[PDB]
Amino acid sequence: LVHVASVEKGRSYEDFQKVYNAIALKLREDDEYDNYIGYGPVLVRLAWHTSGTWDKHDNTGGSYGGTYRFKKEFNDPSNAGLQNGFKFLEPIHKEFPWISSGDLFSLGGVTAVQEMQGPKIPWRCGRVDTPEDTTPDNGRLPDADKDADYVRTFFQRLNMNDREVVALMGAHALGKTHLKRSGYEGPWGAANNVFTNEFYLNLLNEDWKLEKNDANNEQWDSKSGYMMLPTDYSLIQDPKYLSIVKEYANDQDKFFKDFSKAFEKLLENGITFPKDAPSPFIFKTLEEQGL
Numbered sequence: 160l161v162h163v164a165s166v167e168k169g170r171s172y173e174d175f176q177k178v179y180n181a182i183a184l185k186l187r188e189d190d191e192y193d194n195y196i197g198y199g200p201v202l203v204r205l206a207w208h209t210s211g212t213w214d215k216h217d218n219t220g221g222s223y224g225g226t227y228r229f230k231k232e233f234n235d236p237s238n239a240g241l242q243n244g245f246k247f248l249e250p251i252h253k254e255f256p257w258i259s260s261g262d263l264f265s266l267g268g269v270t271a272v273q274e275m276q277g278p279k280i281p282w283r284c285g286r287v288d289t290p291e292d293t294t295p296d297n298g299r300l301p302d303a304d305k306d307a308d309y310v311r312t313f314f315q316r317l318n319m320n321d322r323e324v325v326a327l328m329g330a331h332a333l334g335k336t337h338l339k340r341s342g343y344e345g346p347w348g349a350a351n352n353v354f355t356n357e358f359y360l361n362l363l364n365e366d367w368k369l370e371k372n373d374a375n376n377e378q379w380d381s382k383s384g385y386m387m388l389p390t391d392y393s394l395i396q397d398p399k400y401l402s403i404v405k406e407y408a409n410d411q412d413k414f415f416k417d418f419s420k421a422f423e424k425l426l427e428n429g430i431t432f433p434k435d436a437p438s439p440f441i442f443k444t445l446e447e448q449g450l
């Protein structure tokens with residue numbers, strides 16, 4: 160099945176910059192969430208999980224249809240906690256009812272990365288809501304208790320190569336694991352609502368110990384109070400991933416550029432953009448606008 164991008168009727172860059180801005184202003188205002196981490200990280204994860212159900216083999220799942228709004232997908236165990244990002248976006252959608260669900264979930268992620276001082280992420284409009292029976296089944300998002308071979312094979316289904324995988328994983332600088340959500344507990348670093356290459360630096364430079372958490376799952380822990388999932392740690396166990404981790408730990412600009420490309424790609428998988436579609440939009444941050 161082909162999913163052709165269809166611009167919300169009559170809308171242009173300024174309309175979407177207004178949606179961006181409303182997201183960004185609420186991110187600033189609603190600062191208490193998650194012990195003052197704020198909503199940035201969970202909005203990035205919402206964008207990824209709503210895109211990451213895609214299957215390149217038959218074009219099922221993906222960001223286009225905004226199917227997270229249906230109960231089979233919002234109740235996926237893999238999505239536990241993302242309801243907080245959805246609730247955040249509800250007043251945004253009420254103010255701007257013309258935006259599609261897929262466009263809003265993906266734009267939330269872009270806006271969060273940029274407002275957290277991350278790279279610019281070009282973003283295209285035109286996702287169209289599809290019906291409840293197009294919702295992908297549970298089980299397409301990845302397990303955390305696995306090794307590098309698992310990670311590499313998993314991401315082939317999303318058409319991501321080694322560099323794209325290691326770059327995307329750098330988003331684990333953000334937010335934290337929550338025991339009641341995923342069976343893992345703790346942040347990956349100190350700067351968890353500012354977008355930096357800290358994930359790679361901590362992988363290489365902390366002294367990690369393999370411990371069991373209070374849900375009886377293994378995770379890697381440091382004396383600084385940081386953690387890594389087994390799938391994170393696999394990036395320094397596999398020699399191909401290790402090389403790339405070292406590259407990003409040593410070049411913040413390269414990480415930013417490669418993350419931006421991979422994240423846009425993730426958010427666009429499955430979508431056909433007509434030859435005469437608008438060019439991708441690059442939104443200004445609140446700071447750049449003086450707001």
Ligand code: HEM
Pocket residue numbers: 200201203204207240301302303304310327328330331333334335336337338340341342343388390422
């Ligand atoms: C092998 C792939 C991956 C696995 C197994 C994985 C697993 C996890 C787990 C278990 C959590 C903690 C959930 C919780 O307890 O709240 C988490 C959080 C998160 N993940 Fe991933 N992840 C992967 C890839 C990614 C990618 C590709 C991105 C986005 C580019 C991403 C962004 C995030 C963010 C931002 C959080 C923090 C959420 C919060 O603080 O609420 N992850 N991930």
